[PDB]
Amino acid sequence: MIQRTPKIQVYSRHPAENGKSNFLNCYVSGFHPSDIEVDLLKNGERIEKVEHSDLSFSKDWSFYLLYYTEFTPTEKDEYACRVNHVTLSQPKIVKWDRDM
Amino acid sequence: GSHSMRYFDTAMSRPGRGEPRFISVGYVDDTQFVRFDSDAASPREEPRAPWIEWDRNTQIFKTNTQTDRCSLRNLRGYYNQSEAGSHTLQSMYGCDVGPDGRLLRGHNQYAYDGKDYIALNEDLRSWTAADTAAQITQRKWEAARVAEQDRAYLEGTCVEWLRRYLENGKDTLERADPPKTHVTHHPISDHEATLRCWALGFYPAEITLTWQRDGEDQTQDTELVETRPAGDRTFQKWAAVVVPSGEEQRYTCHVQHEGLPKPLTLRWE
Amino acid sequence: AFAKKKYCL
């Protein structure tokens, strides 16, 4: 059948400021079918109780979800999003870069 | 300006893992106002927009769950598919209105396994079927005069509710929040640098964001990320161009959004 | 009401 691999963006709700509470977002979009596994990582370990949006899709029928959690960025702490989908041979990790 | 009400329904079979999941989400423009999920652990605490003031309505979602399950069984047969596979039925329906609240057009269409299947034409009277399977659906819906029922919903109920929602939610749904904009500069080598044009905090999601070089569009040389939700109702986007060192002032960023009193023209610094 | 009555494909 037709399958579409997810696009992945990792970013903050508000402009990043070290020591200021924020939200870390992982936006997955453009994928088909809808089954997808998304983890947010802090220093390579899974963050617990991550929330997500209700499954919806774009007018081209491709699905999207937002995964999000409260976080306080620091100079040292590394954040990332880990995504698995039927289209991916292995989980894809996208690092949080505060300038993208 | 103009507004839309749209439902996005997903039904997904999962052989050996119970009956197909049905989820329906309703939007006004880029604001979700209702959700129904047949898998919800608590069907009573399902989310609503704060500007919503019902048993008969929950009842329609419950009936729609059963209807989409009927549809998935029929579709498996129309494509000679085995009982073993998972399949997806998606639907989109609703209405677009102008600034006066007048109907612009209605929508009611379906996709199976990510492929367009059948759509109600703009006339709200006739169907476009993608293949010989969807022609079976078309003949059934023609025999049952389904288009007349969909037309009555799209021209009546849909437009009436969208008008009521826009009035009740006017402080948010009819408020356009302009983008907050800035340009960043990142050397990539001695020879080149990235200029990135940022738009943050805007609603609705529709935005135009471009680079020009000497007033010519850089369509092919611009990296444009998908518009993305911030999680506070607003959206974000950026556009980037790689420029020769020392030529930065030849590039401008052009920002168009409903919340701006005038389109923006941004340079580095 | 919420949502539209759907018809089986």
Numbering used by the authors:
A (entry chain B): 0 to 99
B (entry chain A): 1 to 53, 60 to 275
C (entry chain C): 1 to 9
Would you copy out the relevant sentences from the publication that reported this structure?
The structures show that FA (cyan) and FV (yellow) 20mers adopt elongated conformations in which the core residues P1 to P8 are bound inside the groove and the extension residues P-1 Ala (one position N-terminal to P1) and P-2 Arg (visible only for FV 20mer) protrude out of the groove. A similar rotation within the A pocket was also seen in the FA 20mer structure, with P1 main-chain nitrogen and P-1 carbonyl oxygen forming hydrogen bonds to Asn63 and Trp167, respectively. In marked contrast to FV 20mer, however, the main-chain carbonyl group of P1 Phe is rotated toward the α1-helix, a highly unusual configuration, and surprisingly does not engage with any MHC I residues. In the FA 20mer structure, the small side-chain methyl group of P2 Ala allows the P1 main-chain carbonyl group to undergo an unusual rotation toward the α1-helix, which has the effect of orienting the P1 phenyl ring close to Ile52. There is another unusual feature at the N-terminus of the groove in FA 20mer structure. In this structure, the P1 side-chain phenyl ring forms highly unusual hydrophobic interactions with the highly conserved Ile52 of the 310-helix (a conserved element comprising residues 50 to 55). In the FA20mer structure, residues Ser42 to Glu53 were clearly visible due to P1 phenyl ring engagement with Ile52. Specifically, the FA 20mer structure lacks 6 residues from Gln54 to Tyr59, and FV 20mer structure lacks as many as 18 residues from Ser42 to Tyr59 - electron densities at an acceptable 1σ threshold were not visible for these residues in our structures. For FA 20mer, the distribution has a high peak centered around 5 Å, indicating that there is a stable interaction between these two residues. CH-π interaction between P1 and Ile52 exists only in FA and FV 20mer complexes, and it is more stable in FA 20mer than FV 20mer.
Antigen presentation by major histocompatibility class I (MHC I) molecules is central to adaptive immunity. MHC I molecules bind peptides and present them at the cell surface to specific receptors on CD8+ T cells. MHC I molecules bind peptides in a groove that is lined with discrete pockets (A to F). The stability of MHC class I molecules is highly dependent on interaction with a bound peptide ligand.
